[PDB]
Amino acid sequence: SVVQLNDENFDEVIKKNNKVVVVDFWAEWCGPCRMIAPIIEELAKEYAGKVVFGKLNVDENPEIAAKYGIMSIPTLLFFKNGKVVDQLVGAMPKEALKERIKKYL
Numbered sequence: 001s002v003v004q005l006n007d008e009n010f011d012e013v014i015k016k017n018n019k020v021v022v023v024d025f026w027a028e029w030c031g032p033c034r035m036i037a038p039i040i041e042e043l044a045k046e047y048a049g050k051v052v053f054g055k056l057n058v059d060e061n062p063e064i065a066a067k068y069g070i071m072s073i074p075t076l077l078f079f080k081n082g083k084v085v086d087q088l089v090g091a092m093p094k095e096a097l098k099e100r101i102k103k104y105l
Contacts, residue, residue: 001044001045001048001053002024002040002041002044002053002054002055003052003053003054003055004054004055005023005054005055005056005061005064006056006060006061006064007061007063007064010054010056010061010064011082013052013054014054014079014082015081015082016052017081019050019051019052019080020050020051020052020078020079020080020101020104020105021051021052021053021054021078021079021080022040022051022052022053022054022076022077022078022079022097022101023054023055023056023076023077023078023079024036024037024040024053024054024055024056024074024076025056025058025065025068025070025073025074025075025076025077026055026056026057026058026073026074027057027058027059027073028057028059030073030074032073032074032090032091033073033074033091035091036074036091036092036097039093039094039097040053040055040097042094043094043097043098043101047101050105051101051105058070058073068084072089072090074089074090074091075087075088075089075090076088076097076100078100078101078104080104085104086100086103086104088100
């Protein structure tokens with residue numbers, strides 16, 4: 001259950017109480033982003049209920065990428081209680097994303 005993010009729900013999703021929230025900044029044309037898309041879907045199932053995964057398309061929501069100073073995609077930002085706690089820049093394997101999630105559980 002990955003959530004599609006935009007101006008309407010971004011703040012609602014990242015402020016979810018007692019969740020780790022992972023936001024994937026991506027675009028349709030971005031090869032490395034496509035590579036990690038299925039990894040994110042798999043982890044969203046494994047951690048359903050504990051971790052929320054949101055997708056932020058930077059072509060559609062450039063203001064949001066700007067706000068968080070996203071200089072490169074793919075970038076995954078991790079939030080806890082509405083604040084950025086970590087980030088993973090680049091196209092990493094499942095284990096790297098999994099360990100970064102577990103750090104915040």
